[PDB]
């Protein structure tokens, strides 16, 4: 039977670590794929770590120039939560260079975007097969949210964007039932940019905290429900949470207007935020100009009242370790026996040519946390790889 | 309960990619079998990629001289769709250097030909054990279709040939129930050659588009039903689709006669074609004298009226990448919930000594596509291996 999610999000006080891949550390000798961005989705029986393999193994000579992030070789694979992305346990899901997956209660749905830059299209797998295809409409890079989709009452939703990166794009909300699409509406959000949302369900309303890549230090917010009626805005919090940002004491914040800054207009990073009443568990990097470190801030009334009062702070990566994307997902009732959904989030750690020049490859390692009612301290659970690898020499 | 297939083939407008092995690219460091020709068959629960391993791993020194395509070490193995042919997921199916497999609803049937050249015979596995043996009758190389067999109402069919390669052979149609053979009729096709058919069911009639190796540029057609009454002919299409062929404007075509050409008489390549009313989705290589590139042509009335009007064209490999065999298979109702069968086709990409002289080995990588009602663009999903490998140095 289909998986319900019309139940409220759980109030949590601190996040406790759940699993850690050790993907790069083991990969020095073991056969492990080269990943760029992973994410986690939970079905009724088990949670699985999806990732976009680059078609080559670490230390393999095919890892040359893996910084290239769109190629015909990329594929979305799947491994049970915690296990390294090794070559012999990874179940194949779809071909893609941008994807999303979620479990609707019966079988996995997975969306995989492929094709040329200007003529991309998306293939919607359901249970192992393609059932439908969605083509671009503005004929630029088509993109999905790089994290789990949200399924409620058997219908799974996700957000796609097509258009320029550093300028106003066209965003659409999709709705599907048993693989094939059934509804589609466009977001008329003139003043901002919504690229790489992270979504979770909350009492029948899908909420997404997204990435602003155009004249914005602030997280966009999208809220929609069964029949795709939506509200669009910005995370009111007075504490900025995008990677390029001015220090907290200089920022002002706004609920509806985008807020630019000094050199922070044309860049950003995927993030997440959980609403708790009117507060928000906004996650952000420690550094204000680079993807390093990571924090979780519980901002009182940060969802609606431009507040700056940080009630609680937790650090999971100290400032000297590289970080990356971060996304949200929820563990459903069928797996907890709770009467509410337990929030969780995942955090990747990039290592490679983008910041470590000498290496020829680029991979990342995933870490997963979940909320806990009891308060929990933090620690620097860094990846711990030791570069350069044998192939870089 | 046995798997029905007495339902019509589904009308499709374009083929969307489903999976890609990345076998060779991963094999540079991972432990992967050396393949020569793969194919795909779909059961009620999952689809699987079969392949005739050569009994050695890539980069292993045993890969010496793997061009030899019949030796006492080949074996038909099986992997779930999309996963690379690695050494540790691979289930073992049968010993063979020529094989076919299909799922009849209860358990996998698999046929494996083995033995010396002049006294070969076939073993019919059913559910992991042998039940019956079929011996040669003209005492030359015995061959099965190198692609999935067609099962209807529990009876599985396949085509075998024995005799010369460049001259008139003897062809037979087999029918089996729960492993053991029950019926057998010979095809009295005097004017042509039918070697390596690709078959799919269509509303109770098994249809096969085969390979002509003797005075033929044109695809032979075989149609038979429950009790093995058959009709034999040629694909009427005015567009030739065998590898050696004259350009389309010089060809004329015929429904019943073989059509030779200038130097195109004693060679060919396995291919496929799906009937859509009176049109055909004939697949063919891009080049007219080599196995490179790949196209899919929807020829209006090409099945019966010698037409040349190409309504739609799709390219999946540009002319600069090597290609190879191609075969058909259908995803049944049990796995789609549709009231019709969804056509699909697979395309291998050979790399090795046959055209790249310096390498000592020979392997191929599989790519799978499936039909979609919506129109879909094409792209060059090439294998992307980087030869020579470490063992060729």
């Amino acid at each position, epitope marked *: 039977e289909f998986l319900n999610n019309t139940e409220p999000l759980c109030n949590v006080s601190g996040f406790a670590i759940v699993s850690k891949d050790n993907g790069i550390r083991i990969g020095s000798r073991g056969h492990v794929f080269v990943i760029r961005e992973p994410f986690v989705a939970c079905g009724p029986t088990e949670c699985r770590t999806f990732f976009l393999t680059q078609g080559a193994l670490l230390n393999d000579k095919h890892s040359n*120039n*893996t*910084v*290239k*992030d*769109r190629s015909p070789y990329r594929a979305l694979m799947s491994v049970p939560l915690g296990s390294s992305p090794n070559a012999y346990q990874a179940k194949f899901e779809s071909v893609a260079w*941008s994807a999303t997956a979620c479990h609707d209660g019966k079988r996995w749905l997975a969306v995989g975007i492929s094709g*040329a*830059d*200007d*003529d991309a299209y998306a293939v919607i797998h359901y249970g192992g097969m393609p059932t439908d295809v969605v083509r671009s409409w503005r*004929k*630029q*890079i088509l*993109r999905t949210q790089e994290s789990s989709c949200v399924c409620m009452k058997g219908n799974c939703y996700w957000v796609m964007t097509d*258009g*320029p*990166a*550093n*300028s*106003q794009a066209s965003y659409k909300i999709f709705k599907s039932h048993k693989g094939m699409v059934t509804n589609e509406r466009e977001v008329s959000f003139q003043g901002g940019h919504i690229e790489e949302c992270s979504c979770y369900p909350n009492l029948g309303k899908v909420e997404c905290v997204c990435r602003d*890549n155009w004249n914005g230090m602030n997280r966009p917010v999208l809220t929609f429900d069964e029949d795709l009626n939506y509200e669009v805005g910005y995370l009111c919090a007075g504490i900025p949470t995008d990677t390029p940002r001015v220090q907290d004491n200089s920022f002002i914040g706004s609920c509806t207007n985008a807020v630019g800054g000094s050199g922070t207009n*044309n*860049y950003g990073v995927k993030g997440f935020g959980f609403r708790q009443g009117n507060s928000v568990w906004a996650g952000r990097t420690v550094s204000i100009s680079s993807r390093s470190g990571f924090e979780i801030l519980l901002v009182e009334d940060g969802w609606v009242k431009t507040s700056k009062n940080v009630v609680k702070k937790v650090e999971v990566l100290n400032n000297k370790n590289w970080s990356g994307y971060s996304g949200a997902f929820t563990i459903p009732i069928t797996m907890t026996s709770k009467q509410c959904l337990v929030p969780c989030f995942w955090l990747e750690m990039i290592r490679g*040519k983008p910041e470590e020049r000498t290496s020829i490859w680029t991979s990342s390692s995933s870490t997963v946390f979940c909320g806990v009612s009891s308060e929990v301290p933090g620690w620097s659970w860094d990846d711990g790889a030791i570069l350069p690898f044998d192939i870089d020499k | 309960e046995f798997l029905n297939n007495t339902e019509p083939l589904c009308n499709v407008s374009g083929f969307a990619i489903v999976s890609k092995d990345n076998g060779i690219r991963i094999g540079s460091r991972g432990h992967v079998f050396v393949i020569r020709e793969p194919f795909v068959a779909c059961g009620p629960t999952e689809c699987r990629t079969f392949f005739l391993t050569q009994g050695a791993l890539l980069n292993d020194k045993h890969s010496n001289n793997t061009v030899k395509d019949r030796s006492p070490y080949r074996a038909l193995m099986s992997v779930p769709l999309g996963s690379s042919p690695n050494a540790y997921q691979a289930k073992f199916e049968s010993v063979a250097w020529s094989a076919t497999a299909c799922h009849d609803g209860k358990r996998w049937l698999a046929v494996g030909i083995s033995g010396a050249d002049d006294d070969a015979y076939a073993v019919i596995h059913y559910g992991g054990m042998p039940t019956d043996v079929v011996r040669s009758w003209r005492k030359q190389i015995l061959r099965t279709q190198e692609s999935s067999c067609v099962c209807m109402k529990g009876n599985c069919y396949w085509v075998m040939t024995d005799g010369p390669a460049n001259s008139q052979a003897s062809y037979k149609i087999f029918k089996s129930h729960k492993g053991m053979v029950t019926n057998e009729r010979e095809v009295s096709f005097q004017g042509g050659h039918i070697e390596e058919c690709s078959c799919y069911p269509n509303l109770g009639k098994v249809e096969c588009v085969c390979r002509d190796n003797w005075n033929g540029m044109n695809r032979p057609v075989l149609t038979f039903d429950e009790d093995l009454n058959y009709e034999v002919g040629y694909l009427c299409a005015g567009i030739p689709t065998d590898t050696p062929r004259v350009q389309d404007n010089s060809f004329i075509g015929s429904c019943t006669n073989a059509v030779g050409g200038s130097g195109t008489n004693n060679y060919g390549v396995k291919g496929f074609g799906f009937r859509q009313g009176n049109s055909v989705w004939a697949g063919r290589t891009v080049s007219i004298s080599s196995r490179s590139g790949f196209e899919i042509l929807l020829v209006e009335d090409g099945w019966v009226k010698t037409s040349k009007n190409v309504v739609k064209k799709v390219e999946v490999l*540009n*002319n*600069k990448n090597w290609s190879g065999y191609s075969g058909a298979f259908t995803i049944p109702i049990t796995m789609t919930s549709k009231q019709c069968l969804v056509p699909c086709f697979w395309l291998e990409m050979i790399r090795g000594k046959p055209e790249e002289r310096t390498s000592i080995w020979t392997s191929s990588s599989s790519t799978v596509f499936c039909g979609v009602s919506s129109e879909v663009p094409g792209w*060059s999903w090439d294998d992307g291996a980087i030869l020579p490998f470490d063992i060729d140095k």
Partner: antibody
Amino acid sequence: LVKPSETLSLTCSVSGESISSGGYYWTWIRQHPGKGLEWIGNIFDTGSTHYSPSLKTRLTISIDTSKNQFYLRLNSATAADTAVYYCARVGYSLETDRPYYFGLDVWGQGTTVTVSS
Amino acid sequence: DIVMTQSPLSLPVTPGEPASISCRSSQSLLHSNGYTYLDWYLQKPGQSPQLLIYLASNRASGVPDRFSGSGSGTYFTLKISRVEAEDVGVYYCMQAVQTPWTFGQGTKVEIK
């Protein structure tokens, strides 16, 4: 026509599309008689500019989003500056995590400039 | 700047036959972000240039299916599978790696 040592000015217009739509970089390209092409500079919808080093001291390029026009100014024009001038659009970006580039997909008709008395 | 050179100055061709043009650059055009920024442009008599190939291999929209491209590092190649009467013109290669974009010398295609 332009006399030597004067200041050259040119105008280019956009229609169908609107400046600040699609996030394109607008480019000026030059072609001397009998020679190959040469690249002058770029302007983004928001006014950020790039110049070719050899002409950086003479050039000035700007936009007027209300008129859907962008302009080229070249000071101290020499006789050698005689050439055909094209204006084109090119949409590309290098910051984001999904870069793209569609080089110079649209060109306007050339304008012949002769620097002589 | 990237010094760009082009192999044939003039390429005699005839309809129906394959044809090839090549370019070499003084520095590898493999940008740090992994993409290879090189294009090919075609200028027919009495017209402003047109876009053929906008990266090492990608064809532009509307271009005839007869064109192709390949190459990496410093050496690149444009391939015409079947030359036709409409292909007469001057072919320029371009690179978009560095701040100053530079074009090639220009290979003229003359039918024979």
